[PDB]
From a paper:
The translesion synthesis (TLS) DNA polymerases Rev1 and Polζ function together in DNA lesion bypass during DNA replication, acting as nucleotide inserter and extender polymerases, respectively. It belongs to the B family of polymerases and is composed of subunits Rev3, Rev7, Pol31, and Pol32 (24, 25). The Polζ subunit Rev7 is a hub protein that directly binds Rev1 and is a component of several other protein complexes such as the shieldin DNA double-strand break repair complex. Rev7 is a member of the HORMA (Hop1, Rev7, and Mad2 proteins) domain protein family.
The structure of human Polζ is still unavailable, but we examined the crystal structures of human Rev7 in complex with fragments of shieldin-3 (SHLD3), including that with a SHLD3 peptide (41–74 aa), which we determined to a resolution of 2.0 Å to compare the binding modes of yeast and human Rev7. SHLD3 and Rev7 are two of the four components of the protein complex shieldin that plays a key regulatory role in DNA double-strand break repair by blocking DNA end resection necessary for homologous recombination. Since the two yeast Rev7 molecules have different organizations in the Polζ complex, we compared each to our human Rev7-SHLD3 crystal structure, which was determined in a Rev7 monomeric state using the R124A mutation. In the crystal structure of Rev7(R124A)-SHLD3, Rev7 binds the SHLD3 peptide at two sites. In one site, SHLD3 N-terminal loop residues P50 and L51 interact mainly via hydrophobic interactions with Rev7 residues A174, M160, and L173 in the safety-belt region of Rev7. In another hydrophobic interface, residues I60 and A65 in the C-terminal α-helix (αC-helix) of SHLD3 interact with Rev7 Y37 and P38. In human just like in yeast, Rev7 forms a homodimer, but the orientations of the two Rev7 protomers differ radically in the two systems. In yeast Rev7, the safety belt presents a short helix-turn-helix motif, but the one in human Rev7 is a short helix connected to a loop. The small backbone RMSDs with respect to Rev7A-Rev3RBM1 (RMSD 1.20 Å) and Rev7B-Rev3RBM2 (RMSD 1.08 Å) indicate that the yeast and human Rev7 folds are very similar. Although the yeast and human Rev7 proteins display virtually identical folds, their dimeric conformations and how they bind target proteins differ markedly.
Numbering used by the authors:
A (entry chain A): 7 to 208
B (entry chain B): 48 to 74
Amino acid sequence: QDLNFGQVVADVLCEFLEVAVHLILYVREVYPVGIFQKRKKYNVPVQMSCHPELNQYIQDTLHCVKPLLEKNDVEKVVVVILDKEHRPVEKFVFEITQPPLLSISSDSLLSHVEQLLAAFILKISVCDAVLDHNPPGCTFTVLVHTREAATRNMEKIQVIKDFPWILADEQDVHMHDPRLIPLKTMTSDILKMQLYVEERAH
Amino acid sequence: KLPLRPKRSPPVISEEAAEDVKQYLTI
């Protein structure tokens, strides 16, 4: 029928979040380095996992988030690093805002947005210079915070067969007085986004 | 208030499985 820039933004963000998740896992050493292969995204160096099951898990997660992003019902996507005790040790928070009305320039939308996203990737690439090394045996999870007015979130997010979502528990989210590491913010004609890390002092 | 999360956990990747990935699935 006609173009839908809400969907365009959802596609851009899902593509970018996949690359960002992969690079977070690399720079925080959540998995053995051997699975990663250096590649180029947004014209900057990145590290992509080649482990089939991990890649499908990340893609399944984002396939579920995409329709919520298309409707602008996502407030933030959070990549949480968890210790052996299931307690958050680091949180990479992607705060996502789509303006209620867009004013779109005519000269190369995606190219401009992709240049802005490359800065996020570069920041993630060097965030280990200010974060303390995580304890051994950490895992990760993804948290989706929806807008208060969002309706039927639990049904809308169940896109993938055999990949159910559940409400997180207090233990899944809470950190006591974490350090704040601002990484990057951007404003474009179609989306505003901020990325920062919350690090457990421990 | 509380966010949503996947019920399933991501896979565990042993040091050995990583060598297999590096051997066959990289360029």
